Design a protein around this ligand. Structure first.
Ligand SMILES: NC(=O)c1ccc[n+]([C@@H]2O[C@H](COP(=O)([O-])OP(=O)(O)OC[C@H]3O[C@@H](n4cnc5c(N)ncnc54)[C@H](OP(=O)(O)O)[C@@H]3O)[C@@H](O)[C@H]2O)c1
Ligand SMILES: CCOc1ccc(C=O)cc1-c1cc2nc(N)nc(N)c2cc1C
Length: 157
């Protein structure tokens, strides 16, 4: 299976100055639950943003840099390389990867951040005419997690 994994706000903002615009521990827990034991494919900027590979899963970085050879990270240099990766592969960002992959993926695991943030990078537009809502689950709020959010699993019709 090839899936997108993304958090975007009400206006599809995903990032600002190479980081997330929001602090939301529960979204990171969601990512952990979905992708542990599986594969993440990410662009070079996203990787440099996190700074090290995420534990307990295969981290794959897409870059044109032929000098890229980082411990605990597998590198790929083409979109076409993604299709040779076994198991459940999650397209992990950022904007460029999402734009390149949204027409190719089986499904999407979206965390809708129910706020309006300043962004400089965006998830591409999509329509529910093309995507069935397999599930929609409201995130629980508390002291550590104060921004309303909804976990959507969308499957291409
Ligand atoms: N909210 C979220 O779900 C989420 C998730 C991840 C990231 N983000 C945010 O997204 C933003 C970053 O997005 P971005 O678009 O600027 O960068 P990005 O997608 O993370 O990385 C862009 C880089 O990926 C590489 N790349 C992409 N397609 C390629 C291809 N076909 N062949 C070779 N290399 C390719 C290139 O690296 P080289 O220049 O080295 O060739 C390119 O410059 C940040 O603000 C970050 O915080 C948000
Ligand atoms: C680009 C900055 O994003 C991060 C920085 C730190 C951490 C820490 O776990 C996680 C993220 C992060 C959260 C994310 N959350 C969701 N729902 N989906 C993603 N595709 C995603 C990707 C990254 C990279």
């Amino acid at each position: 299976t090839l899936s997108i994994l993304v958090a975007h706000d009400l206006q599809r903002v995903i990032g600002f100055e190479n980081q997330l615009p929001w602090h939301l521990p529960n979204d990171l827990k969601h990512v952990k639950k979905l992708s542990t034991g599986h594969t993440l494919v990410m662009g070079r900027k996203t990787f440099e943003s996190i700074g090290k590979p995420l534990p307990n899963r295969r981290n794959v970085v897409l870059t044109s840099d032929t000098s890229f050879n980082v411990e605990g990270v597998d590198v790929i240099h083409s979109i076409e390389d993604i299709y040779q990766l076994p198991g459940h592969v999650f397209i992990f960002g950022g904007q460029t990867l999402f734009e390149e992959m949204i027409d190719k993926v089986d499904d999407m695991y979206i965390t809708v951040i129910e706020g309006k943030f300043r962004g400089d990078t965006f998830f591409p537009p999509y329509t529910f005419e093309d995507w069935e809502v397999a599930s929609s689950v409201e995130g629980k709020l508390d002291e550590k997690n104060t921004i309303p959010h909804t976990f959507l699993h969308l499957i291409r019709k």
